[PDB]
């Protein structure tokens, strides 16, 4: 809501899969906010794992 007046972007015809997604995450607040919910929910599962990774006997 402070950047929206400015972003008169243009896509490159030679763009990669990476650089189409580097553009998407600027272009799209629904995709951007949806990933912030993924990062959030992955951070909850991370903090329940903590120090424990090397305590696994096979």
């Amino acid at each position: 809501a402070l950047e929206e007046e400015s972003v008169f972007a243009v896509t490159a015809v030679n763009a990669s899969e990476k650089t189409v997604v580097e553009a998407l995450f600027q272009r799209d607040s629904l995709v951007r906010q949806s990933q912030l919910v993924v990062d959030w929910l992955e951070s909850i599962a991370k903090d329940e794992i903590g120090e424990f990774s090397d305590n696994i006997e096979f």
Binding site: A1, E4, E5, V7, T11, V13, D28, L30, V31
Partner: protein, 167 residues
């Protein structure tokens, strides 16, 4: 230049057998013609991709931008409208439909309806304040009261400073 885009598109359509595979390259062909200002050749190569990928919101948006660069207001709006139908996340394109409708007709209930849709995606926006301003000074004495309530209720979010208080 044109002749370099034509030489590339000739050799790249030589390195293509079937017609649908030539149409699948049409998006790329169209942006190279646009990068030569060959706007009809861009339109002609994006439409021959769209008639093979009917549901691509960027191909519809690119055809809309080509009609905006041919001053064809409602065809730019229709291709942008169709891109919002095919990807509703484009808040910017909901606003651009209001921007091209209020620049075509101020009485158009579609202009006012797409501004309604832009405001409900971007509250507290001076670019939406002035798209209301451009309708309400044209709504007369019934306009005056809506313009008063607007000025007070959107100044109460954040002014531009100076201008709206002098007006």
């Amino acid at each position: 230049s044109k002749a370099d885009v034509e030489r590339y598109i000739a050799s790249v359509q030589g390195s293509t057998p079937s017609p649908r595979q030539k149409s699948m390259k049409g998006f790329y062909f169209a942006k190279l013609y646009y990068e030569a200002k060959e706007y009809d050749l861009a339109k002609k190569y994006i439409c021959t991709y769209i008639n093979v990928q009917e549901r691509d919101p960027k191909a519809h948006r690119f055809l809309g931008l080509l009609y905006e660069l041919e001053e064809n207001t409602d065809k730019a709006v229709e291709c942008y409208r169709r891109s919002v139908e095919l990807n509703p996340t484009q808040k910017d394109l909901v606003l651009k439909i209001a921007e091209l409708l209020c620049k075509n007709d101020v009485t158009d209930g579609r202009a006012k309806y797409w501004l309604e849709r832009a405001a409900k995606l971007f509250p507290g926006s001076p670019a939406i304040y002035k798209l209301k301003e451009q309708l309400l000074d044209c709504e007369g004495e019934d306009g005056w009261n809506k313009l008063f309530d607007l000025i007070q209720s959107e100044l109460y979010v954040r002014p531009d400073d100076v201008h709206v208080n002098i007006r």
